Enzyme design. Structure first.
Site, PDB file in Angstrom:
ATOM      1  N   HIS A 165       0.687  -6.974  -0.528  1.00 32.07           N
ATOM      2  CA  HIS A 165       0.816  -7.794  -1.750  1.00 32.07           C
ATOM      3  C   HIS A 165      -0.527  -8.229  -2.335  1.00 32.07           C
ATOM      4  O   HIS A 165      -1.558  -8.087  -1.684  1.00 32.07           O
ATOM      5  CB  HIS A 165       1.762  -8.975  -1.603  1.00 32.07           C
ATOM      6  N   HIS A 174      -1.708   0.430  -6.978  1.00 29.98           N
ATOM      7  CA  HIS A 174      -0.610  -0.465  -7.386  1.00 29.98           C
ATOM      8  C   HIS A 174      -0.904  -1.983  -7.183  1.00 29.98           C
ATOM      9  O   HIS A 174      -0.679  -2.785  -8.106  1.00 29.98           O
ATOM     10  CB  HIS A 174       0.704  -0.029  -6.738  1.00 29.98           C
ATOM     11  N   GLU A 175      -1.391  -2.368  -5.994  1.00 30.44           N
ATOM     12  CA  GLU A 175      -1.739  -3.774  -5.708  1.00 30.44           C
ATOM     13  C   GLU A 175      -2.823  -4.342  -6.644  1.00 30.44           C
ATOM     14  O   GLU A 175      -2.816  -5.533  -6.969  1.00 30.44           O
ATOM     15  CB  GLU A 175      -2.217  -3.922  -4.262  1.00 30.44           C
ATOM     16  N   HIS A 188      -1.535  -5.635  -9.933  1.00 30.21           N
ATOM     17  CA  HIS A 188      -1.151  -7.008  -9.657  1.00 30.21           C
ATOM     18  C   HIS A 188      -2.354  -7.983  -9.654  1.00 30.21           C
ATOM     19  O   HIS A 188      -2.344  -8.996 -10.398  1.00 30.21           O
ATOM     20  CB  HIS A 188      -0.424  -7.067  -8.343  1.00 30.21           C
ATOM     21  N   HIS A 242       5.731  -5.733 -12.582  1.00 31.95           N
ATOM     22  CA  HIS A 242       6.477  -4.458 -12.455  1.00 31.95           C
ATOM     23  C   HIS A 242       6.966  -3.806 -13.720  1.00 31.95           C
ATOM     24  O   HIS A 242       7.417  -4.450 -14.641  1.00 31.95           O
ATOM     25  CB  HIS A 242       7.580  -4.524 -11.406  1.00 31.95           C
TER      26      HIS A 242
HETATM   27  C1  LIG Z   1       6.389  -8.385  -5.426  1.00 30.72           C
HETATM   28  C2  LIG Z   1       6.389  -7.612  -4.113  1.00 30.72           C
HETATM   29  O1  LIG Z   1       7.472  -6.658  -3.965  1.00 30.72           O
HETATM   30  C3  LIG Z   1       7.515  -5.996  -2.667  1.00 30.72           C
HETATM   31  C4  LIG Z   1       7.560  -4.439  -2.685  1.00 30.72           C
HETATM   32  C5  LIG Z   1       6.174  -3.735  -2.704  1.00 30.72           C
HETATM   33  O2  LIG Z   1       6.034  -2.416  -1.978  1.00 30.72           O
HETATM   34  C6  LIG Z   1       5.229  -1.429  -2.537  1.00 30.72           C
HETATM   35  C7  LIG Z   1       3.898  -1.689  -2.825  1.00 30.72           C
HETATM   36  C8  LIG Z   1       3.138  -0.711  -3.475  1.00 30.72           C
HETATM   37  C9  LIG Z   1       3.687   0.522  -3.870  1.00 30.72           C
HETATM   38  O3  LIG Z   1       2.864   1.424  -4.507  1.00 30.72           O
HETATM   39  C10 LIG Z   1       3.221   2.429  -5.329  1.00 30.72           C
HETATM   40  C11 LIG Z   1       3.908   2.179  -6.520  1.00 30.72           C
HETATM   41  C12 LIG Z   1       4.254   3.224  -7.372  1.00 30.72           C
HETATM   42  C13 LIG Z   1       3.863   4.519  -7.015  1.00 30.72           C
HETATM   43  F1  LIG Z   1       4.196   5.533  -7.815  1.00 30.72           F
HETATM   44  C14 LIG Z   1       3.185   4.787  -5.819  1.00 30.72           C
HETATM   45  C15 LIG Z   1       2.877   3.731  -4.970  1.00 30.72           C
HETATM   46  C16 LIG Z   1       5.020   0.787  -3.594  1.00 30.72           C
HETATM   47  C17 LIG Z   1       5.774  -0.201  -2.927  1.00 30.72           C
HETATM   48  C18 LIG Z   1       5.206  -4.527  -1.889  1.00 30.72           C
HETATM   49  O4  LIG Z   1       5.398  -4.450  -0.668  1.00 30.72           O
HETATM   50  N1  LIG Z   1       4.191  -5.224  -2.450  1.00 30.72           N
HETATM   51  C19 LIG Z   1       3.996  -5.260  -3.776  1.00 30.72           C
HETATM   52  O5  LIG Z   1       2.977  -5.965  -4.261  1.00 30.72           O
HETATM   53  N2  LIG Z   1       4.787  -4.624  -4.652  1.00 30.72           N
HETATM   54  C20 LIG Z   1       5.818  -3.873  -4.194  1.00 30.72           C
HETATM   55  O6  LIG Z   1       6.507  -3.333  -5.068  1.00 30.72           O
HETATM   56 ZN   LIG Z   2      -0.774 -12.078   2.305  1.00 28.49          ZN
HETATM   57 ZN   LIG Z   3       4.392  -4.366  -6.707  1.00 30.07          ZN
END
Ligand SMILES: CCOCCC1(Oc2ccc(Oc3ccc(F)cc3)cc2)C(=O)NC(=O)NC1=O
Ligand SMILES: [Zn+2]
Ligand SMILES: [Zn+2]
Ligand SMILES: [Ca+2]
Length: 168
Positions: free
Chosen positions: A84, A119-120, A123, A129
């Site tokens: 996260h 992805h992180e 954020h 999302h």
């Molecule tokens: C708000 C949190 O929701 C929890 C689900 C969680 O899991 C992921 C975290 C990152 C991910 O990364 C991606 C996303 C999209 C892609 F195409 C390839 C990889 C995919 C899943 C996560 O564990 N941590 C996250 O920050 N976001 C996610 O979606």
């Molecule tokens: Zn943490």
């Molecule tokens: Zn996420």
């Protein structure tokens, strides 16, 4: 005063990050490349710049942990939660944690660190999302592989809504 302050974005273009510790599963240089390249995903289409600090306070602090690991958003063992990151701000703002109960790779086995980090960091920069199943900010892991990776246009439009375009 009356209502709570807020922060949907960073006030400054030049961000620092620090790698506080390292997963057992990849070499230091592997991890370093993954995070460098995850950040270049965003800096490529915005004025944002990212620099590495080896010690001390940085804007974006990155570490690896299992279970209760210091912020009361516990991890869950392998699968489920993967990582996260906190939105922009002072203190914990922008900070990214990766579940070290996962198996992280520079390839297609386990979770490719670079994809999950790119992805992180969205954020970390203020992106929530996407409902576009092709988009990187879409909360489902899909594997891609470094040289086939292009930031899809929904994450382009998303991040440029906050920071505008980069050079070009
Ligand atoms: C708000 C949190 O929701 C929890 C689900 C969680 O899991 C992921 C975290 C990152 C991910 O990364 C991606 C996303 C999209 C892609 F195409 C390839 C990889 C995919 C899943 C996560 O564990 N941590 C996250 O920050 N976001 C996610 O979606
Ligand atoms: Zn943490
Ligand atoms: Zn996420
Ligand atoms: Ca997990």
């Amino acid at each position: 005063y009356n209502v709570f302050p807020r922060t949907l974005k960073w006030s400054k273009m030049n961000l620092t990050y620090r790698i506080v510790n390292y997963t057992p599963d990849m070499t230091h240089s592997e991890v370093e490349k993954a995070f460098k390249k995850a950040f270049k995903v965003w800096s490529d289409v915005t004025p944002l710049n990212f620099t590495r600090l080896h010690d001390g306070i940085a804007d974006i602090m990155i570490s690896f942990g299992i279970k209760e690991h210091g912020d009361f958003y516990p991890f869950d063992g392998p699968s489920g939660l993967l990582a996260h990151a906190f939105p922009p701000g002072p203190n914990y703002g922008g900070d990214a944690h990766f579940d070290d109960d996962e198996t992280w790779t520079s390839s297609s086995k386990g979770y490719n660190l670079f994809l999950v980090a790119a992805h992180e960091f969205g954020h970390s920069l203020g992106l929530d999302h996407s409902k576009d199943p092709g988009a990187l900010m879409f909360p489902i892991y899909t594997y891609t592989g470094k040289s086939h990776f292009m930031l899809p246009d929904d994450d382009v439009q998303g991040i440029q809504s906050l920071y505008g375009p980069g050079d070009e």
